[PDB]
Design brief:
It is classed as motor protein. The entry lists the keywords Actin, Myosin, Smooth muscle, Cryo-EM, Cryo-ET, Heavy meromyosin, motor protein. The entry is titled "Homology model of Acto-HMM complex in ADP-state. Chicken smooth muscle HMM and chicken pectoralis actin". Chain A is Myosin, heavy chain 11, smooth muscle. The structure is cut from a larger assembly and holds 1 copy of chain A and 2 copies of chain B. Helix content of chain A is 45%, strand content 10%. Chain A is built from 23 helices and 12 strands. In chain A, helix 11 packs across helix 12, helix 12 (276-284) packs antiparallel against helix 18 (488-495) and helix 16 runs antiparallel to helix 20. The two termini of chain A are 34 Å apart. Chain B has 13 helices and 17 strands. By secondary structure, chain B is α+β, with helices and mostly antiparallel strands. In chain B, the strands form 6 sheets. A 5-stranded mixed sheet of chain B has the order 12-11-10-15-16. A 3-stranded antiparallel sheet of chain B has the order 1-2-3, sandwiched between helices. A 3-stranded mixed sheet of chain B has the order 8-9-17, sandwiched between helices. Chain B has helices at 79-94, 113-126, 137-144, 182-196, 203-215, 223-229, 256-262, 274-284, 287-295, 309-319, 338-348, 359-365, 369-373; strands at 9-12, 17-20, 29-31, 35-38, 65-68, 71-72, 75-76, 104-107, 131-136, 151-154, 160-163, 176-178, 238-242, 246-250, 297-298, 329-330, 357-358. The chains are: A alpha+beta, B alpha+beta. Chain A binds chain B through residues 252-256, 288-293, 295-300, 412-416, 420, 423-425, 427-430, 435, 439, 510-511, 516, and chain B through 2-5, 19-29, 93-95, 144-146, 328-334, 341, 344-345, 348-350, 353.
């Protein structure tokens, strides 16, 4: 009701536990202006009422004045305050400091929209990655750098998508938006004539593949991509797309090689400039890397079409990675003191979604480890509280409320954890989703927040008591986006590309599952959040439909829990939530059983 | 190494030994079980001055060397030279210490206790392995094939086995532990080369004959047609040169080897063949269950590398079945080392955590711990 | 409960337990009171990781299965197998838990306390049935074709039973509990098949024989003549084959079973005849009343579903009676399942709401509430 009537009275910005709850209106409230830039320059989180500029100054004065690098935590549903609170701090610093470079972030974002952002449920232009915008400050705390970076590039989404979750939008941006001239340069089969883009939303909701594809091209250019660098980028989008269509025919016994009809390989290889025959036959016949030798136990055509999906996955992954690279090339100043920095967060936080699958397990577990930093720094400020007074009570490390949810996803052997049970079954020369759910069930006790479902439900499904609240996972379609027998022969062919920019994408050439890759992307964004004083800005939905001035406190706490801020509030409660000041106690409780102690009494303690 | 057991693997058969580790679909290293030692070691005009020629090292100067086999038909026989081979496998071939990684030493099912003891004690006294699985040389061929059940053959250079996977899996009367393998194939090739006139008496010349076979050999689907073909060097009487000036013209004798595996009548005593005791394993399985194993006639080993092993063995096993039941051979994308592949893949999943002899398992339960962990 | 009580129907006897729903004319499934349990359930190529095979699921893998019985002689011989039976019937075949689904099971009259206690307990301790019902197997077959009065012989593939209804209802010394079921014709069949040379020992082969008796079988109208014909493969020597090539040309043996239906003493038991005990349960009343018993001899259940049954039994009751009181036999529109069909009808009827065993009925009134509700 505080949150609700506050937002309703305008106060999107409510403190909660110890966090700047931005019950995001999705309009960057003019609490980011130079007046508020300076009304907070000098004014950290708790110094002033709840603000991305209170916390933006926490960050800054840690950067200039405390000479400590910073990271404005900004968690929650993708685009539910992310760009809101991120550009909030960006401008705070832009005038507090010298910003300019984050401005290419805003033109990075459409490209991030293209190849890194994939649609999601509570957001259409949703970053299916979490990015951080590290604004790099002089020792004087002056924005001489700003470099953005995306992790949780759901290469799975680059191949197999989620519900209300398009691929990385460009795949769509490509077919609709990339011209049919490109559609043939990019040999762009239709959205669902491509194995990917199987998600129904051809365009982004409230958006279009055409216009955000042109955002894609032009913004790639503003980052430094030629429309032929862009067009090879797009050939990659489309050739990834082609890959799922490239099927390598299998045999009854565990065999090695068959795909005669490499016309989808013909397409991927025209786009990538690579050889259709090398691509094909070497997915037929990859040199399986086994030790002192790399033996032609050529991947069973199981692993061959798995190398196909792996090629598409890692192909588009390094596509958007080189893309975000150019993003940062023209984005950041190559000159910066940057002796301090501020990593402002734009991630899809605790995602309360309907599809909870490989990509969504990795996303929700990512936000698990992120809100662990969040609630642990809430523990930090709660301890700061108890040490501020003489408080015999230093209540539990509060990010610990997250941990059993987390190794639940992580444990790789010794009966292992969920995503790493997936990883096991991808370490097999074959695919074993059956042994995957074998491990899910037998390991549900080996996890501490694994909710292995009922006698009949657990058989392929289960749950994972995420810190988003429990999130039910059917882990049966994860190996196909995780097996990743990335065919080093075919990816080297992608380096052997005749499309030279395609080679630039995978100048880098079986096991190493994608579950581990997405845990990696988590840990990356997690360090970018935690490596500093995690600056307490929260991105809260009064409506994930990107609305302003409308609220139900329902969606408020939905994102609070999604930012862990409901948990952070419980955690202030899990600690010392309130603090009746001494003289507050004297006023309040002279009438309440003081009786020799009139209010305004002398002895702070003894009164 | 990786987040698995990532357990090392000595796919140590009796004619070949394969180094490696988990998370891999094919042998990391292949060096014969044959460890060699020169005849005139010391200083010669010819030789290369070594002592224990671990693996193909043996095969070098057979004109002036000799060649022993630390494993003979899965019986890990010279566990000094098998320690040479385990040093080779993990400490040299793997070049990752046996002492550091769980290792996996492959063995003939129902191997003598002594060989098991060697494998374990040695991983845990000569190679101080944290936790080594003495893995069933055939059941590994099974695990590599993408299967965990069926007719489980490991045929040839090295040693032949056939594990049934039914109500029973491993018994001194349920698994074919076939000492009829590419070793007997080699010995017979030697005998018939002497018949033609190619006198081979020393184990150096027997390994000459083995390297002949393993390359000049044929799983004789029809021994006799190609035998008449190979009375002269047509396509099936092939030559082999030792670099000292020795050319060996191997007649029908090429495919006279694998037939020893299948049809041991080539030798002249009262013994049994490969597919026969293979079906003996399948027969411990019930009517329905011999029918069952028939589907997975998993095969591996050295004689599985001579032309026709799938056709020969499956012709035979299909015939070795109630005609109400058909049989199909599983051919891994690598058979002779599908022992290695299965051991390493067992090492890859959680399964190796369930299957090693720990170093402690040994030091406590003696080397009998093999029996106490894996036969 | 449940105006049309939706009440699940388990025609449970020694053989076919029939699954289904309120108000239907044939069971939603049929599966004998037999649960299969393999020998060792090893990791076979053909295995199931399960041990409890309810119904014909027992009949399935007999090559490795031993086949136990939930009911025999209308006696629940295994309530845990009847747990299996109602998991099958309701949880599996009705695919609707007997929990929350009233279960108009069946149960023979004069069943020992054990069977009623079980049926209710299973239904209320494995299956927590909101409203179980075990109605009279025979009176259920009565209710199948829409009857309410007459002597309704029901011998399902469970116990042989007859409840002579008249202007009132039957007597406890005039109610047939014949030492007979589908199991007895089965076992006699096994013995007589072994006689001619079709040997059966195990419950595997005995249940081979039960599926013979249920299908390779015939109500013998001229038993010994057909026997002579079928001592050689001429007219009733009809081969069931165990799928290993075990030729069982069930000759005389087939219709030798329903001869045990009409004469259960063929096995060695001192029981009476089925149609004879119809006549007996008929006579035990007054002229007008025993006559009403004479009249309507509904032959019903599974073992009265062999070729020639009704008129055989009818000639029987006529010859086995005075000429002062006539006898007629009713063939239910689905006779083998008439027990089930009357269960389903009583279920749809208000009568299940007038006759059923509630879960609480057992929990408070003891399991004797089945005694209070099964008659």
């Amino acid at each position: 009701h505080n949150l609700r009537e506050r937002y309703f009275s305008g106060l999107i910005y409510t403190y909660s536990g110890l966090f700047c709850v931005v019950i995001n209106p999705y309009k960057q409230l003019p609490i980011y202006s130079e007046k508020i830039i300076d009304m907070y320059k000098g004014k950290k989180r708790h110094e002033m009422p709840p603000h991305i500029y209170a916390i933006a100054d926490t960050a800054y004065r840690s950067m200039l004045q405390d000479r400590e690098d910073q990271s404005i935590l900004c968690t929650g549903e993708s685009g539910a305050g992310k760009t809101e609170n991120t550009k909030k701090v960006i401008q705070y610093l832009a005038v507090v400091a010298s910003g300019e470079l984050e401005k290419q972030l805003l033109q990075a974002n459409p490209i991030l929209e293209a190849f890194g952002n994939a649609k999601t449920v509570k957001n259409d232009n949703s970053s299916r990655f979490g990015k951080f915008i590290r604004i790099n400050f002089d020792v004087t705390g002056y924005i001489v750098g700003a470099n953005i970076e995306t992790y949780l590039l759901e290469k799975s989404r680059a191949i197999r998508q989620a519900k209300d979750e398009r691929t990385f939008h460009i795949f769509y941006y490509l077919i609709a938006g990339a011209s049919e001239q490109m559609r043939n340069d990019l040999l762009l089969e239709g959205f669902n004539n491509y194995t990917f883009l199987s998600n129904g939303h051809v365009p982004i909701p409230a958006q279009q593949d055409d216009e955000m594809f042109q955002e894609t091209l032009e913004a790639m250019t503003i980052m430094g991509f030629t429309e032929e660098e862009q067009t090879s980028i797009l050939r990659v989008v489309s050739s990834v797309l082609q890959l799922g269509n490239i099927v390598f025919k299998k045999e009854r016994n565990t065999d090695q090689a068959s795909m005669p009809d490499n016309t989808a390989a013909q397409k991927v290889c025209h786009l990538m400039g690579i050889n259709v025959t090398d691509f094909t036959r070497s997915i037929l016949t990859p040199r399986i890397k086994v030790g002192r030798d790399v033996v032609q136990k050529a991947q069973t055509k199981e692993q061959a079409d798995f190398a196909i999906e792996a090629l598409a996955k890692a192909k588009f992954e390094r596509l958007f990675r080189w893309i975000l690279t150019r993003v940062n090339k023209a984005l950041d100043k190559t000159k910066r003191q940057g002796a301090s920095f501020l990593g402002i967060l734009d991630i899809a936080g605790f995602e309360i979604f309907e599809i909870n699958s490989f990509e969504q397990l990795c996303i929700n577990y990512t936000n698990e480890k992120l809100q662990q930093l969040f609630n642990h720094t809430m523990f930090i400020l709660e301890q700061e509280e108890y040490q501020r007074e003489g408080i015999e009570w230093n209540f539990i490390d509060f990010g610990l409320d997250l941990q059993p949810c987390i190794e639940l996803i992580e444990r790789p052997t010794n009966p292992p954890g969920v995503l790493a049970l997936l990883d096991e079954e991808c370490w097999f020369p074959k695919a074993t989703d059956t042994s995957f759910v074998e491990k899910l069930i037998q390991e549900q006790g080996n996890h501490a927040k694994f909710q292995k479902s009922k006698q009949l439900k657990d058989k392929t499904e289960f749950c994972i008591l995420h810190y988003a609240g429990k999130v039910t996972y059917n882990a049966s379609a994860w190996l196909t986006k995780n097996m990743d027998p990335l065919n080093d022969n075919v990816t080297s062919l992608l380096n052997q590309s005749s499309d030279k920019f395609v080679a630039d994408l995978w100048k880098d050439v079986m096991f190493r599952t994608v579950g581990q890759l997405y845990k990696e992307q988590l840990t990356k964004l997690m360090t970018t959040l935690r490596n500093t004083n995690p600056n307490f800005v929260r991105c809260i939905i009064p409506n994930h439909e990107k609305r302003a001035g409308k609220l139900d406190a329902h969606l408020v706490l939905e994102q609070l829990r999604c930012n862990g801020v409901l948990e952070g509030i419980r955690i202030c409660r899990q600690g010392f939530p309130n603090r009746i000041v001494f003289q507050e106690f004297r006023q309040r409780y002279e009438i309440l059983a003081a009786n020799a102690i009139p209010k305004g009494f002398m002895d702070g303690k003894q009164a | 190494d990786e987040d698995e057991t990532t357990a090392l693997v000595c796919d140590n058969g009796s004619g070949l030994v394969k180094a490696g580790f988990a998370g891999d679909d094919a042998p990391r290293a292949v060096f014969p079980s044959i460890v060699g030692r020169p005849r005139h070691q010391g200083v010669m005009v010819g030789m290369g001055q070594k002592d224990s020629y671990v693996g193909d090292e043996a095969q070098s100067k057979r004109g002036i060397l000799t060649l022993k086999y630390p494993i003979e038909h899965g019986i890990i026989t010279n566990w000094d030279d098998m320690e040479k081979i385990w040093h080779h496998t993990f400490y040299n071939e793997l070049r990752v210490a046996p002492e550091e990684h769980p290792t996996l030493l492959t063995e003939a099912p129902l191997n003598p206790k002594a060989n098991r003891e060697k494998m374990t004690q040695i991983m845990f006294e000569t190679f101080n392995v944290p936790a080594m699985y003495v893995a069933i040389q055939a059941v590994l061929s099974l695990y590599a094939s993408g299967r965990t059940t069926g007719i489980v053959l490991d045929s040839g250079d090295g040693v032949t086995h056939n594990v049934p996977i039914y109500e029973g899996y491993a018994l001194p009367h349920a698994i074919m532990r076939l000492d009829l393998a590419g070793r007997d194939l080699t010995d017979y090739l030697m005998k018939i080369l002497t018949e033609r006139g190619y006198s081979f008496v020393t184990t150096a010349e027997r390994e000459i004959v083995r390297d002949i076979k393993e390359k000049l050999c044929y799983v004789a689907l029809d021994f006799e047609n190609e035998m008449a073909t190979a009375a002269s060097s047509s396509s099936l009487e092939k030559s082999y040169e030792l670099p000292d000036g020795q050319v060996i013209t191997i007649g029908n004798e090429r495919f006279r080897c694998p037939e020893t595996l299948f049809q041991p009548s080539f030798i002249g005593m009262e013994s049994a063949g490969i597919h026969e005791t293979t079906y003996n394993s399948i027969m411990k399985c019930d009517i329905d269950i011999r029918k069952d194993l028939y589907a997975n006639n998993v095969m591996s080993g050295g004689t599985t590398m001579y032309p026709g092993i799938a056709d020969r063995m499956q012709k035979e096993i299909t015939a070795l079945a109630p005609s109400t039941m058909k049989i199909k051979i599983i051919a891994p994308p690598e058979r002779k080392y599908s022992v290695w592949i299965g051991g390493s893949i067992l090492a890859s999943l959680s399964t190796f955590q369930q299957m090693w002899i720990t170093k402690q398992e040994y030091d406590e339960a003696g080397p009998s711990i093999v029996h106490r962990k894996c036969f």
